[PDB]
Amino acid sequence: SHMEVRTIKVFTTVDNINLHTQVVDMSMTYGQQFGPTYLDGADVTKIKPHNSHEGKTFYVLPNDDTLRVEAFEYYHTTDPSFLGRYMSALNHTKKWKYPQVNGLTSIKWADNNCYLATALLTLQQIELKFNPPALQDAYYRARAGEAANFCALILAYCNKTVGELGDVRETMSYLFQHANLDSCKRVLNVVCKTCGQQQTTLKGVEAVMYMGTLSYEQFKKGVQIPCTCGKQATKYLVQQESPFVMMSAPPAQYELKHGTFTCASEYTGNYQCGHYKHITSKETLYCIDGALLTKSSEYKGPITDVFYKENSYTTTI
């Protein structure tokens, strides 16, 4: 009747660093013993242990106080589905290719990941330190060329699944949310001919992102925005303290000039499907399109996001 019990030792984890010794019954599934369980991204919840599994590390969900703390300390989230979504993505991104293109880690196109490739390429050209150890650790590996965990983390943090259409501005917003931008400061002035002037200070992520124009110069000169009185008012940059700025707008034909920006994202398509490309300004203009690379002296296209170097700026207005 009853089969002789066989067991193996395995380790469970939520961060792949702190291991937790377990003894599993090879006649029960992982799911029956751990809840949802993953082996390097693969869902083994419904798998019964193999001898080859002995000594291997499995991710589980934070189901006790020790794992909850380890997971928060490593990822800076308490979203219950986070680890599941991170493993589900990782099962895909570990099969993506990450070619070095013009010295930067890119991503060969798959699974609508073009927005991720230009986000990744952008990160490697701006000064940014992540706060979660998971992002620090994974970004370091991504810079070295092994970007699978980093890309799966971006998907998890953004609540995007592999293959879902993503927006670069929104993705960067999530990444900046988890970065140290505390010393970034922006002072704006808005001037209405009827209502007068109103100055506003922004900090952190809101200090480095602007939605409305791609041109940093235009933002220094002034952009027209609605005023509550019904007139159009003029908003201009008074003071900026940050290592970069990101200027974003709905996709519009726009000319990129060598040496006047750091990098940019281009979006061809519509609200339901499209394709992002990346433009970086080095010795010439390089267009990185996943694994593909072209160059040109001028660039014009439907640009959505442009990144600029900064340190300290003060208006003369």
Site map 192..221 versus Zn ion, x via CB under 5 A: x-xx--------------------------
227 binds Zn ion (CB under 5 A): yes
221, two tokens: 């000169």
Q: Which is nearer to Zn ion, 81 or 197 (CB)?
A: 197
Among residues 20, 76, 258, 275, the one annotated as catalytic is 275
Binding to Zn ion by residue 229, rule CB under 5 A?
yes
Report the nearest approach of Zn ion to the CB of residue 229 (Å).
3
Closer of 152 and 223 to Zn ion (Cβ): 223
Q: How far is CA 273 from CA 27, 34, 115, in A?
A: 46, 39, 12
Which among 60-68, 87-95, 191-199, 281-289 is the span making contact with Zn ion, rule CB under 5 A?
Answer: 191-199
Listed ranges 12-20, 53-61, 144-152, 224-232: which one lies at the site for Zn ion (CB under 5 A): 224-232
Question: Looking at 137, 167, 289, 305, which residue is catalytic?
Answer: 289
Q: Helices in the chain by DSSP H: which ranges? A: 30-34, 65-75, 82-93, 114-123, 133-144, 148-158, 168-177, 205-208, 216-221
Contacts of residue 46, Cβ cutoff 8 Å, sequence gap at least 6: 29, 30, 31
The encoded tokens of residue 262 equal 């750091």
Give, for 118, the enclosing helix (H) or strand (E).
helix 114-123
Residue 55 three-state SS: coil
- According to DSSP, residue 206 is labeled H
Rounded least distance, CB 200 to Zn ion, Å: 15
Q: Does 292 bind Zn ion (CB under 5 A)?
A: no
Residue 53 and residue 10 in contact, taking contact as beta carbons nearer than 8 Å: yes
Q: 98 near 106, Cβ under 8 Å?
A: yes
Interface of this chain with Zn ion, residues 126 to 185, rule: CB under 5 A: none
Check the annotation: does 195 bind a ligand.
yes
Is 151 a catalytic site residue?
no
Composition of the chain by helix, strand, coil, percent to 5:
25, 35, 35
Report whether 229 belongs to an annotated binding site: yes
192 is in an annotated binding site: yes
As annotated, the binding site includes 192, 195, 227, 229
Annotation: binding site for Zn(2+): 192, 195, 227, 229
Residues near Zn ion (CB under 5 A) are: 192, 194-195, 227, 229, 231
